[PDB]
Amino acid sequence: PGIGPKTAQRLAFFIINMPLDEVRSLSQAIIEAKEKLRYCKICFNITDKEVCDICSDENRDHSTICVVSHPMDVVAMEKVKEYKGVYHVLHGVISPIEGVGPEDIRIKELLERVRDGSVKEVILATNPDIEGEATAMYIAKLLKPFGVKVTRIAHGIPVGGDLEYTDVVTLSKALEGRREV
Amino acid sequence: PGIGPKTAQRLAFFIINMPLDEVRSLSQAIIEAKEKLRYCKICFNITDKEVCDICSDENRDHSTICVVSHPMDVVAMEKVKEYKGVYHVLHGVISPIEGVGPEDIRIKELLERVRDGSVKEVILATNPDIEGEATAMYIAKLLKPFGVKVTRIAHGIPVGGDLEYTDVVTLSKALEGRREV
Ligand SMILES: [Zn+2]
Ligand SMILES: [Zn+2]
């Protein structure tokens, strides 16, 4: 079980409630996963190829990057179809409380992506909670010295909800409502 | 497959970052988990032995039973670090809406802990909503006859929320202030 402590506990709870046939399916799924899935060379989203079909799609706006904590959040933003840009998946947020610093989440590679002056906007779409907002805060500040417009998906997402389980209606609105700095 | 939206995500993360050899080990583990996993003979919490690791610790105050609806709920009362007693997991609540009665949750078991055996207090930690309250009431009505001091978690997730989703400080406080009867 090469798996983290709090996650093992969750699988245990899940597994005990699930029928035999699904347990088998999970165990097959896990193997399939291990060999089909990859991190994208470019956005670090979960995909099945070296480059995700969003990044490999030269019909998209590569000059606008949407930064999300997780792959699911790519999924949520892709239910608008109003967004034509590309993404960056952080794979976490900055959380002192869990010993996850900026060096442990994909911040350096976002930075490397702004080197070639090719990036025009970076939209920050982490959660409206404290770790979400603070991660946003840091990134804004890290990219300031460079030539890049940085915006923050507006309020429209409630107290502490998830960018990821938010309905296409309110997301669209918050993406349109982007504040600068 | 069988797995919650967030959990699936961290799982996939681990899979992608361990060696194939270990992923194969892991698949076998999942099925093995399903063979081993079980409800505690005493509290009905999720465990791999006949008796859970808390019911089996003799340090713990087996006289005070904290009554909870779900395993994750124990998990949350375990971030207390004041609480020293044992639990009972009901596995849900009396719920007129979903048609679940007293017979369908571990209430009887809770009584043949207080009847057969030596108990000095029951802390009712079901949720604060109608369902949680009715459950609590129903139990307190059934534990009247025996001596036991029966108290109730007071001042919980203002909502609307669940116990399993609350602050350590908040719980610590709600616990410190349990009132009878
Ligand atoms: Zn990509
Ligand atoms: Zn037990």
Residue numbers in the entry:
A (entry chain A), B (entry chain D): 16 to 196
Give sentences copied directly from the paper behind this entry.
RecR is the most conserved protein in the RecFOR pathway; RecR binds to RecO, and RecO interacts with SSBs, then the complex facilitates RecA filament formation on ssDNA-binding protein (SSB)-coated ssDNA. RecR is a zinc metalloprotein, which consists of a helix-hairpin-helix (HhH) motif, zinc finger motif, Toprim domain and C-terminal hydrophobic region. At present, the HhH motif is thought to be required for binding DNA, the zinc finger motif plays a structural or DNA-binding role and the RecR Toprim domain is the binding site for both RecO and RecF. In this study, we investigated the structures and biological function of Thermoanaerobacter tengcongensis RecR (TTERecR) and its series mutants.
Two TTERecR16-196 monomers exist in a back-to-back conformation in the asymmetric unit, and two monomers from different asymmetric units form the TTERecR16-196 dimer by their N-terminal interaction, with an interface area of about 5581 Å2. Furthermore, the crystal structure of TTERecR16-196 revealed that TTERecR16-196 formed an N-N dimer, not a C-C terminal interaction. The most notable difference was that the interface area of the TTERecR N-N dimer had a negative potential, whereas the interface area of the TTERecR16-196 dimer had a positive potential. Additionally, the C-terminus of TTERecR16-196 interacted with the Toprim domain to form a globular C-terminal region, which is apparent different from the C-terminus of TTERecR. In the full-length TTERecR N-N dimer, the hydrophobic residues Val106, Phe109 and Ile110 of the loop with the HhH domain created a hydrophobic patch for the interaction with TTERecO; however, this hydrophobic patch was destroyed in the TTERecR16-196 mutant, preventing the binding with TTERecO. The helix α1 is essential for formation of the TTERecR N-N dimer and the TTERecOR complex, although helix α1 is located far away from the other three functional domains.
